Design an enzyme around this catalytic site. Sequence first.
Site, PDB file in Angstrom:
ATOM      1  N   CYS A 164       3.625   1.587   9.279  1.00  0.00           N
ATOM      2  CA  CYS A 164       3.516   0.441   8.371  1.00  0.00           C
ATOM      3  C   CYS A 164       4.884  -0.003   7.854  1.00  0.00           C
ATOM      4  CB  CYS A 164       2.513   0.691   7.252  1.00  0.00           C
ATOM      5  SG  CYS A 164       0.902   1.245   7.851  1.00  0.00           S
ATOM      6  N   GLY A 224       2.476   5.996   9.708  1.00  0.00           N
ATOM      7  CA  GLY A 224       3.904   5.969   9.429  1.00  0.00           C
ATOM      8  C   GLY A 224       4.590   4.708   9.936  1.00  0.00           C
ATOM      9  N   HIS A 245       0.814  -1.222   0.000  1.00  0.00           N
ATOM     10  CA  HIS A 245       0.000   0.000   0.000  1.00  0.00           C
ATOM     11  C   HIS A 245       0.862   1.293   0.000  1.00  0.00           C
ATOM     12  CE1 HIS A 245      -0.107  -0.299   4.528  1.00  0.00           C
ATOM     13  NE2 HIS A 245       0.204   0.991   4.379  1.00  0.00           N
TER      14      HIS A 245
HETATM   15  C1  LIG Z   1      -3.056   5.220  11.057  1.00  0.00           C
HETATM   16  C2  LIG Z   1      -2.401   3.879  11.269  1.00  0.00           C
HETATM   17  C3  LIG Z   1      -1.887   3.531  12.513  1.00  0.00           C
HETATM   18  C4  LIG Z   1      -1.388   2.260  12.715  1.00  0.00           C
HETATM   19  N1  LIG Z   1      -1.337   1.326  11.759  1.00  0.00           N
HETATM   20  C5  LIG Z   1      -1.843   1.648  10.565  1.00  0.00           C
HETATM   21  C6  LIG Z   1      -2.422   2.891  10.283  1.00  0.00           C
HETATM   22  N2  LIG Z   1      -2.985   3.202   9.025  1.00  0.00           N
HETATM   23  C7  LIG Z   1      -3.385   2.306   8.123  1.00  0.00           C
HETATM   24  O1  LIG Z   1      -3.835   1.218   8.453  1.00  0.00           O
HETATM   25  C8  LIG Z   1      -3.482   2.800   6.692  1.00  0.00           C
HETATM   26  C9  LIG Z   1      -4.185   1.760   5.849  1.00  0.00           C
HETATM   27  C10 LIG Z   1      -5.484   1.952   5.402  1.00  0.00           C
HETATM   28  N3  LIG Z   1      -6.223   1.009   4.798  1.00  0.00           N
HETATM   29  C11 LIG Z   1      -5.662  -0.194   4.626  1.00  0.00           C
HETATM   30  C12 LIG Z   1      -4.353  -0.488   5.008  1.00  0.00           C
HETATM   31  C13 LIG Z   1      -3.765  -1.781   4.774  1.00  0.00           C
HETATM   32  N4  LIG Z   1      -3.266  -2.792   4.598  1.00  0.00           N
HETATM   33  C14 LIG Z   1      -3.607   0.517   5.615  1.00  0.00           C
END
Ligand SMILES: Cc1ccncc1NC(=O)Cc1cncc(C#N)c1
EC number: 3.4.19.12
Lengths: 304, 304
Positions: A145, A143, A41
């Site tokens: 990921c 950030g 992603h």
């Molecule tokens: C804000 C944040 C904080 C912690 N971990 C993750 C996030 N953000 C996300 O998940 C962004 C995202 C959106 N849709 C699908 C995927 C996938 N695979 C990833």
Amino acid sequence: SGFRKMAFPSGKVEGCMVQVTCGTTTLNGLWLDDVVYCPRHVICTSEDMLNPNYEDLLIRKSNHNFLVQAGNVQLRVIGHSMQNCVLKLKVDTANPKTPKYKFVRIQPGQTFSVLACYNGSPSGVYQCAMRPNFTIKGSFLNGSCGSVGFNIDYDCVSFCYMHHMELPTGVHAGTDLEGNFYGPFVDRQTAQAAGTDTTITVNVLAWLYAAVINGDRWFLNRFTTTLNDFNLVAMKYNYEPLTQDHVDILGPLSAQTGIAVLDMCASLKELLQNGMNGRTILGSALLEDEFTPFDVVRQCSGVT
Amino acid sequence: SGFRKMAFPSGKVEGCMVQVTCGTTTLNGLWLDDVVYCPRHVICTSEDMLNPNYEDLLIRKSNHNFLVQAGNVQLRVIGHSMQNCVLKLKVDTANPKTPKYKFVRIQPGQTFSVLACYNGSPSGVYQCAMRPNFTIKGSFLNGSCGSVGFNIDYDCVSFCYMHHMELPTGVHAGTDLEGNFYGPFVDRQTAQAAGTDTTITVNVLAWLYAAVINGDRWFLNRFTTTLNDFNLVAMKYNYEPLTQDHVDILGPLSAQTGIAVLDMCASLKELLQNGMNGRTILGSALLEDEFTPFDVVRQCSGVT
Ligand SMILES: Cc1ccncc1NC(=O)Cc1cncc(C#N)c1
Ligand SMILES: Cc1ccncc1NC(=O)Cc1cncc(C#N)c1
């Protein structure tokens, strides 16, 4: 003496963290040998995330669009490929800090350390369990990921998790290092059900053995139980059914303490039915399930 | 999303760990620049430990008696000196992996990460608080002496603790990196009183702010209190008295959440007087005091 939620030393993993940017999205990558692994992603904009067609989005990208930076050194991308939900960026330089490593898919109930990173920089390390429902209760912000989970056996790092997503409920989801999600999740900004979770019974029993080893023994009782009777109590309290395979893995702790597994199950049965009565076990007021029997043996014997 | 007991990435500290042997005793040393720091009780036999005369015991030792090994490389000892309860071994080679560092004496209530080591090898990392009574509730076995505690501000490691001793009660004691014990302890195999401990009030309030930030808000109430009224409750429950300096350090969390410090104190007052009623806060069934306001801001903002 003492029993802590200990993480593996993160040094060997720190040397692998890089920053990967594609367009306006930046996240973390894992540089092992001449390949950088990161969540696919990274190629999406916020609008793409609602329903991404990753094959189409990746077609618009070329090797030079993936900016990979390890500290201050910029890596030259000579190939790119998508495997499941991960992108594999071939670089012209093998990471000199690549430790001995393996990619492993862990089972639910197993534990691992997470090195939380932002912009390719490590911020913290913590130990967690892969829940029976394939989610992890981590600590991750935007950030993070591409931050990875791992276990270490002497000099070998077994990478087991890469962080991809935060569900609407604040729990976390990710993949193994081949990009296969743990659980039913998909890398899309859509509400997604995480199954009914349960408490990891074998881990709770392991932690009860660690408590006995460290002097916390108020919960030991004059009772015993059977696997069948215990499992009726486990079902009532949303605990994983205990099997002979779990009893077998608890053998070293049973031998060290002289407390038969089914006798420890009777103590757990009484704590489930009666609570802790305002008391604590190893500094906790609830039943801890993030220590496997292997973790308890390792911590109680000082394995390096 | 999520809030974990996070430790600092231990990589910069791992590169400093060495094994120090003197006679038949082996423990951990910290190699920074051309000096190896370790507990002075490395020069003792088990019989010496009952009442050691360190000046006399050190007089029997020469540079060649201190065996220092960093992984597989053996270091050449060209000087030795005792400073308080630490031995400083001058080596002919500066550690190439010496990070930017400082030696700091932390205040009670402050937190730090411990890299537990055995035979100069890292086994695990965990976060802990220096108790108000100057003990630490760690996880240390025989061979862990010389393991260090530290904090990291971007690229600078501030070493604050070196492990020396396990008290008869299973709690731990150690020194700063100048060898001065935290607390009234002495490096001798004698029963030693650790003072009355208290709960770190400012840390509990910080953790309550972290809970609000992460969505756990059932404990917020319609009440407020004063510093005086709160402190009467704190005294009753063996909590540290809250001062305006503590309120001042909670300012960023009060500003981020819009919950005035004294309103959060009223929530803490109600939890102390009524308990948690079988509920949890950030996965804990008790009031957590091992996160400082600085730790909460750092973890909730993603500081690397
Ligand atoms: C804000 C944040 C904080 C912690 N971990 C993750 C996030 N953000 C996300 O998940 C962004 C995202 C959106 N849709 C699908 C995927 C996938 N695979 C990833
Ligand atoms: C067995 C163990 C485990 C964890 N930490 C430490 C230990 N052992 C010790 O404390 C050994 C010792 C004895 N008397 C005084 C000092 C000092 N200073 C040290």
